[PDB]
Design an enzyme around this catalytic site. Structure first.
Site, mmCIF file in Angstrom:
data_model
loop_
_atom_site.group_PDB
_atom_site.id
_atom_site.type_symbol
_atom_site.label_atom_id
_atom_site.label_comp_id
_atom_site.label_asym_id
_atom_site.label_seq_id
_atom_site.Cartn_x
_atom_site.Cartn_y
_atom_site.Cartn_z
ATOM 1 N N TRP A 168 -5.605 5.883 8.696
ATOM 2 C CA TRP A 168 -6.791 5.683 9.533
ATOM 3 C C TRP A 168 -7.797 6.816 9.564
ATOM 4 O O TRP A 168 -8.986 6.597 9.862
ATOM 5 C CB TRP A 168 -6.361 5.394 10.966
ATOM 6 C CG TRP A 168 -6.045 3.944 11.200
ATOM 7 C CD1 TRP A 168 -4.833 3.358 11.365
ATOM 8 C CD2 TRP A 168 -7.018 2.912 11.332
ATOM 9 N NE1 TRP A 168 -4.991 1.992 11.574
ATOM 10 C CE2 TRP A 168 -6.330 1.702 11.541
ATOM 11 C CE3 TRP A 168 -8.407 2.891 11.227
ATOM 12 C CZ2 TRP A 168 -6.987 0.481 11.679
ATOM 13 C CZ3 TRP A 168 -9.067 1.645 11.356
ATOM 14 C CH2 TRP A 168 -8.352 0.482 11.593
ATOM 15 N N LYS A 188 -11.148 6.524 8.101
ATOM 16 C CA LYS A 188 -11.802 5.294 8.547
ATOM 17 C C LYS A 188 -12.271 5.271 9.994
ATOM 18 O O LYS A 188 -13.041 4.409 10.392
ATOM 19 C CB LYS A 188 -10.872 4.109 8.312
ATOM 20 C CG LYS A 188 -10.533 3.930 6.862
ATOM 21 C CD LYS A 188 -9.565 2.796 6.635
ATOM 22 C CE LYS A 188 -9.355 2.571 5.146
ATOM 23 N NZ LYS A 188 -8.216 1.626 4.924
ATOM 24 N N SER A 197 -1.096 -12.433 2.609
ATOM 25 C CA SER A 197 0.162 -12.385 3.349
ATOM 26 C C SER A 197 0.414 -13.690 4.064
ATOM 27 O O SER A 197 1.570 -14.051 4.196
ATOM 28 C CB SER A 197 0.233 -11.198 4.353
ATOM 29 O OG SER A 197 -0.703 -11.376 5.410
ATOM 30 N N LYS A 251 -6.129 2.651 -8.294
ATOM 31 C CA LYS A 251 -5.394 1.452 -8.627
ATOM 32 C C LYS A 251 -5.064 1.379 -10.104
ATOM 33 O O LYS A 251 -5.975 1.522 -10.944
ATOM 34 C CB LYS A 251 -6.173 0.226 -8.189
ATOM 35 C CG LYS A 251 -6.247 0.066 -6.669
ATOM 36 C CD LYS A 251 -7.379 -0.859 -6.251
ATOM 37 C CE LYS A 251 -7.584 -0.848 -4.748
ATOM 38 N NZ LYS A 251 -8.585 -1.844 -4.268
ATOM 39 N N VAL A 291 -3.541 -5.723 -1.515
ATOM 40 C CA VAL A 291 -2.122 -5.859 -1.258
ATOM 41 C C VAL A 291 -1.982 -6.540 0.119
ATOM 42 O O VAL A 291 -2.908 -6.466 0.932
ATOM 43 C CB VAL A 291 -1.392 -4.501 -1.262
ATOM 44 C CG1 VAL A 291 -1.343 -3.948 -2.664
ATOM 45 C CG2 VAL A 291 -1.979 -3.506 -0.277
ATOM 46 N N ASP A 338 0.441 2.198 5.024
ATOM 47 C CA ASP A 338 0.230 1.635 6.359
ATOM 48 C C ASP A 338 -0.480 0.282 6.394
ATOM 49 O O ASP A 338 -1.308 0.027 7.256
ATOM 50 C CB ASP A 338 -0.599 2.628 7.199
ATOM 51 C CG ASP A 338 -2.019 2.853 6.660
ATOM 52 O OD1 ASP A 338 -2.206 3.061 5.428
ATOM 53 O OD2 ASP A 338 -2.951 2.871 7.483
ATOM 54 N N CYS A 339 -0.210 -0.567 5.436
ATOM 55 C CA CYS A 339 -0.871 -1.890 5.410
ATOM 56 C C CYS A 339 -0.035 -2.803 6.310
ATOM 57 O O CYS A 339 1.146 -3.053 6.027
ATOM 58 C CB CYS A 339 -0.888 -2.455 3.981
ATOM 59 S SG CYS A 339 -1.533 -4.141 3.917
ATOM 60 N N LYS A 397 0.827 -1.223 0.000
ATOM 61 C CA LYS A 397 0.000 0.000 0.000
ATOM 62 C C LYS A 397 0.848 1.254 0.000
ATOM 63 O O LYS A 397 1.732 1.370 0.844
ATOM 64 C CB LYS A 397 -0.947 -0.022 1.216
ATOM 65 C CG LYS A 397 -1.858 1.196 1.324
ATOM 66 C CD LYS A 397 -2.763 1.187 2.552
ATOM 67 C CE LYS A 397 -3.671 2.417 2.619
ATOM 68 N NZ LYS A 397 -4.365 2.535 3.937
ATOM 69 N N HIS A 454 0.280 -0.309 14.745
ATOM 70 C CA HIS A 454 -0.972 0.412 14.492
ATOM 71 C C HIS A 454 -1.707 0.704 15.779
ATOM 72 O O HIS A 454 -2.163 1.822 16.007
ATOM 73 C CB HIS A 454 -1.876 -0.379 13.547
ATOM 74 C CG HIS A 454 -1.555 -0.172 12.118
ATOM 75 N ND1 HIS A 454 -2.486 0.343 11.242
ATOM 76 C CD2 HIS A 454 -0.425 -0.375 11.399
ATOM 77 C CE1 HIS A 454 -1.949 0.425 10.041
ATOM 78 N NE2 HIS A 454 -0.709 -0.013 10.103
#
Ligand SMILES: N[C@@H](CCC(=O)N[C@@H](CS)C(=O)NCC(=O)O)C(=O)O
Length: 212
Positions: A206, A209, A72, A46, A59, A18-19, A7, A159
């Site tokens: 964040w 969100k 992942s 994207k 991702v 921040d992924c 990301k 996070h």
């Protein structure tokens, strides 16, 4: 020639975003001392070539043996198989330690109702982690050396720290001293330092969100 899509930072698409799943993969690549190319994907715009190789538009994605592989969990398992040394396998009994922290953290971060039990649910998961850490040899979950579970948890605990600190002025209670020590241990790993998202990009990631 390994390549990884991760990301891009919200508001700065030429910087690492921040992924935490992307970071778990980067951590694994670094702990295996592997060479790779990074592609920063702006998730709000994207590129077509990326949509063509990541069918869900997610991702991370790793290019290995000329196949692009998502998830992942799968990415870190394939790396462990293809590059066995140094080993990162976590003993099965400990492989799910801390696994509910990130979810309870997100629910508490987004809570508007301080009587909804969300703080308590996070504190329960933190207490489970404290209880593991105080009763098993460290400094990592599985002892002397970092392993897969630590690499999964580190980005998530980062996070938690940055986002709850910034959005809520909230930090892990001082009554969880092992959790504090463990976080300090993870965040000072050379691999963590090399692969970390700047705090301001955890915040920008964040911000839209927290309270949709
Ligand atoms: N379970 C997947 C989760 C990956 C994931 O959720 N990635 C997020 C970024 S943290 C994503 O690509 N979201 C797509 C978007 O926001 O458009 C993994 O472990 O790789």
């Amino acid at each position: 020639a390994l390549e990884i899509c991760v990301k891009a930072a919200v508001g700065a698409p030429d910087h690492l975003g921040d992924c935490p799943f992307s970071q778990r993969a980067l951590l694994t690549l670094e702990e295996k001392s592997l060479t790779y190319k990074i592609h920063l994907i702006n998730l709000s715009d994207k590129p077509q070539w990326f949509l063509d190789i990541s069918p869900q538009g997610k991702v991370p994605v790793l290019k290995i043996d000329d196949k692009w592989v998502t998830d992942s969990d799968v990415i870190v398992g394939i790396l462990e198989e293809k590059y066995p040394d140094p080993p990162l396998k976590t003993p099965a009994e400990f492989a799910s330690v801390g696994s509910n922290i990130f979810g309870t953290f997100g629910t508490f971060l987004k809570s508007k109702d301080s009587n909804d039990g969300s703080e308590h649910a996070l504190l329960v998961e933190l207490e489970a982690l404290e209880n593991h850490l105080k009763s098993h040899d460290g400094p990592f979950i599985a002892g002397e050396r970092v392993s897969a579970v630590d690499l999964s948890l580190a980005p998530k605990l980062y996070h938690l720290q940055v986002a709850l600190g910034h959005f809520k002025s909230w930090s892990v209670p001082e009554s969880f001293p092992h959790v504090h020590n463990y976080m300090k241990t993870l965040f000072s790993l050379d691999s963590f330092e090399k692969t970390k998202t700047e705090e301001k990009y955890v915040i920008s990631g964040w911000a839209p969100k927290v309270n949709p």
